[PDB]
Design a binder for this molecule. Sequence first.
Ligand SMILES: CCCCc1ccc(S(N)(=O)=O)cc1
Ligand SMILES: OC[C@H]1O[C@@H](O)[C@H](O)[C@@H](O)[C@@H]1O
Ligand SMILES: [Zn+2]
Length: 257
Amino acid sequence: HWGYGKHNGPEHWHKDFPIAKGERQSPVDIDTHTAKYDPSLKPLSVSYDQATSLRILNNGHAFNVEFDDSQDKAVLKGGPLDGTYRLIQFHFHWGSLDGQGSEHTVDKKKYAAELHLVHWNTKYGDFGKAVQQPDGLAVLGIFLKVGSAKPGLQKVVDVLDSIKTKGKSADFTNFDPRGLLPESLDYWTYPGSLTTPPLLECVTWIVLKEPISVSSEQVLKFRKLNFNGEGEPEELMVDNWRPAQPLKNRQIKASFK
Ligand SMILES: CCCCc1ccc(S(N)(=O)=O)cc1
Ligand SMILES: OC[C@H]1O[C@@H](O)[C@H](O)[C@@H](O)[C@@H]1O
Ligand SMILES: [Zn+2]
């Protein structure tokens, strides 16, 4: 099956997922000079006060922190979005070294990691129906650089030892995703896709300009996870990022002048 290695990584995905060569694939390089301020963007609203986290899962590609999305609790609205998008999960992509790991790049610069907060458009009822729609999903992307520790990340870091291998999960209630945000909500936005198979072209991307800082020790613990299952040969979960894809017939808009 698909993965990130030489034999099953991003350059192979198109064989089983031909949309990998499509017209609105993600991630992309964000050329900051060409991105244009868009006065039609409404204020962005990240409303996570009532978020209900449930569980953390190693799915063999990353780890997902899952939320109860059975009601409007944690939601994203405003900005480029029409209507209400409900938080379902977050996960990260990261590197083997601090010099790589992000999926989006900024003037070609790669960050150490990238956080994706995944939301679905409530007008479509369920995530599965949302991924049949061209405006089904909104992903809030946040870059990570290595410097000072992020206190709100430490609870995630400390549970990773309990989900080392593919298929393991752990209770992860009462986690507040507000502790993963930077100060500023300045962002870039463009229409794109999921960055892993099935690569579906459903996503409004909202990528924050301000990175969060995490410590070297925090990211080193991400890199102790395993792609493999229990009892199988150890393959460190590192470099689980897709490189930038062709921009094609798209424009990146900025929320800030
Ligand atoms: C049909 C299940 C799809 C799950 C999925 C959700 C989000 C992303 S990402 N990396 O944020 O674009 C990738 C995959
Ligand atoms: O025709 C002019 C228009 O061109 C578009 O490509 C830009 O997105 C708009 O901001 C601009 O007003
Ligand atoms: Zn992702």
